[PDB]
Amino acid sequence: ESETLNPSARIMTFYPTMEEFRNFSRYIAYIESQGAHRAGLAKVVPPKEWKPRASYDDIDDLVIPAPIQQLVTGQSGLFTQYNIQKKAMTVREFRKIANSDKYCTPRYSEFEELERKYWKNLTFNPPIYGADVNGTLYEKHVDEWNIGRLRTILDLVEKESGITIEGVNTPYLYFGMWKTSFAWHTEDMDLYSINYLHFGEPKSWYSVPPEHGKRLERLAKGFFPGSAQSCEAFLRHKMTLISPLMLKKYGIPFDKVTQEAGEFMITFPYGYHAGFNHGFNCAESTNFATRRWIEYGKQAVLCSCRKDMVKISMDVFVRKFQPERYKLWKAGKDNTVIDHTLPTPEAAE
Ligand SMILES: O=C(O)c1ccnc(-c2cn[nH]n2)c1
Ligand code: NI
Ligand SMILES: [Zn+2]
């Protein structure tokens, strides 16, 4: 039944009405009832009626406390990205650098051309990314899909322990320029993410279906045996770039999609994704959860080589939503096998 929905595991695109848009978790359950999650990634175009902010005309004074310069080393589709933190910088300061001749977007016809230039010039002329900036650009009154307060069960982490995890249960802003990249990865604890492109040039995405996620990991371990030896989940470092041609060459299924300003992207549990920004832009994102995520959370394979990595206690989720398995899980005997095709329980409504 779930297997017969989106059997291609293709990236789907949704155009909700304004009435459908009002209840966030309900629409996530809906697009899962249509098999969107099998792709790992889905686009959701909100009604023209909607806007999270009246104008972006005041933000040139907003500070980017830790701009990152992205050095990239590699060849023939395989790359490792190193981060060089620059000194703090305002948005107007950043836009100036980004729109300057040295860093601006090259001219091109179709997207496949800009794509080709991206993978051709990835290692040259290191751009700067205004990444992981704590904040939101939603006006305080917007209630539909407000990244600052989605009200999903991920809120249970803060409710129970008081713990905030920047960018995970709090929002991050991302100021991009041409050729700034996000490496191949899943979310922390294999959560969902929501990404909103407030303004600027597009952001292109690659996705690998969760049901093929393990195939991508085997390939990545093969190409980076050193990194694999020293960490059980090195892709969570978010340093590893792999071109779509390399994926084709080794039979990994994937899809691609380009995100325009004013569009949402949803990534799903264990959905590997990567991509790049076309030019100057601004994006807001955070993580969230559904009842389906819990099993993913229990089984997420985490980065083993840093003490500073994101680790969420699953205990309170298992107690509340899987009480009959708590004794078993806590005794390490819960061998529930995940079916990636199944939609989340809430989609019964
Ligand atoms: O750089 C982005 O726009 C982006 C896109 C997709 N994922 C992330 C990200 C950063 N940490 N977890 N996920 C960042
Ligand atoms: Ni992500
Ligand atoms: Zn690690």
Numbering used by the authors: 4 to 352
From the paper:
The introduction of Nε-methyl lysine methylation marks is catalysed by histone methyl transferases and their removal is catalysed by histone lysine demethylases (KDMs). Human KDMs are classified into two families according to their mechanisms; the lysine specific KDMs (KDM1A and B) which employ flavin adenine dinucleotide (FAD) as a cofactor and the 2-oxoglutarate (2OG) dependent KDMs, the JumonjiC (JmjC) KDMs,3 which are part of the wider 2OG oxygenase superfamily and which use 2OG and molecular oxygen as cofactors. The JmjC KDMs are grouped into five subfamilies (KDM2/7, KDM3, KDM4, KDM5 and KDM6).6 They have conserved 2OG and Fe(ii) binding sites, the precise nature of which are subfamily specific. The different members of the JmjC KDM family accept different substrates (typically methylated lysine residues on the N-terminal tails of histone H3, H4 and to a lesser extent H1);8 selectivity is mainly engendered through differences in the substrate binding pockets and by the presence of other recognition domains in addition to the JmjC domain.
In order to find selective inhibitors of JmjC KDMs, a new scaffold was designed based on the 2,2′-bipyridine series wherein one of the pyridine rings was replaced with a triazole ring (e.g. compound 14a) to give a different potential iron binding motif. It was proposed that the triazole-N atom would be able to coordinate the catalytic iron atom and readily enable alternative vectors for compound elaboration. Replacing the pyridine ring with the 1,2,3-triazole ring resulted in a greater than ten-fold reduction in potency for KDM3A, 4C, 4E, 5C and 6B, but a less than two-fold reduction in potency for KDM2A and 4A. Although compound 14a is very small (MW 190.2) it shows a preference for KDM2A and 4A/C. This is likely to be due to residue differences in the active site of the different JmjC KDMs. Although it was not possible to crystallise compound 14a with KDM2A it was co-crystallised with KDM4A as a surrogate. KDM2A and KDM4A have similar substrates and are both able to demethylate H3K36me2.8 The co-crystal structure of compound 14a confirmed that a representative of the triazolopyridine series occupies the 2OG binding site in KDM4A and provided insights to inform the design of KDM2A selective inhibitors. The triazolopyridine scaffold itself does not extend substantially into the substrate pocket. However we anticipated that through the introduction of appropriate substituents on the triazole ring at N-1 and C-5, the activity and selectivity for KDM2A could be improved by making interactions in the substrate pocket. A co-crystal structure of the simplest example 14a with KDM4A demonstrated that it binds to the JmjC KDMs via active site metal chelation. A new KDM inhibitor scaffold has been discovered through the incorporation of an alternative triazole metal binding motif to the known 2,2′-bipyridine-4-carboxylate scaffold.
